[PDB]
Subunit: 90 residues, 3 copies
């Protein structure tokens, strides 16, 4: 009874954590669309300067997206929790 | 002894993870304020064009905030860990 | 056999979660560089107005970075998982 209970608690905690990580990736993705449109906007406004990075005389920063990596890992983890719940009944 | 130890370890890990998720939401919220002010700034600069999205001739991106969802879930999880610690003593 | 198995599962879950949190911090850091360059860009374009916040007649938003806090916590957690794996063999 004790081992399955702690097993159940682990699955529940990991599920809750996984949904929260999804929420964070959801926000990062949403915010990133706004930020990259803002960069396109600044590049438009400074087109004659060659874009905002050249206007600033700076090394240019670009976004390194990992949305697919995170979403796959979370889905694969959630799929494993589904299997684990089943085996606790069985 | 073993079961409470693994129980203790689960609670400690989940607590540490939960604080790190809070940190991520803290940064997302902070960065989002900067990004949305940047959008207001671009919309001001291109007011005569109808704002930055129309100036870019693009579908307009807006931010989808989930801060309250995440913060509630984390607080509710931390509250449960508090109860679990108590029951391990009891 | 059961206790080490659930112990193993906890370590594996926490490891997977920790890597995903790293991914999120990686994206936040990358996106933050783009956002802060965008702010410098807007401040350049509105230099005569005193920068974008004064041009907007708004309280100015600045980014509160916690990258080092998160990365340390994750590395320290991963180091502990390494020790725990070893003790499960021993
Ligand atoms: Cl489990
Ligand atoms: Cl931005
Ligand atoms: Cl527990
Ligand atoms: Cl463990």
């Amino acid at each position: 009874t004790q081992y399955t209970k702690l097993s159940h608690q682990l699955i529940s905690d990991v599920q809750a954590i996984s949904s929260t990580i999804q929420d964070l990736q959801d926000q990062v993705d949403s915010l990133a669309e706004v930020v990259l449109q803002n960069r396109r906007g600044l590049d438009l406004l400074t087109a004659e300067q060659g874009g905002i990075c050249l206007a600033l005389q700076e090394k240019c920063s670009f976004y390194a997206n990992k949305s697919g990596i995170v979403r796959d890992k979370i889905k694969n983890l959630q799929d494993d929790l589904e299997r684990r719940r089943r085996q606790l009944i069985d």
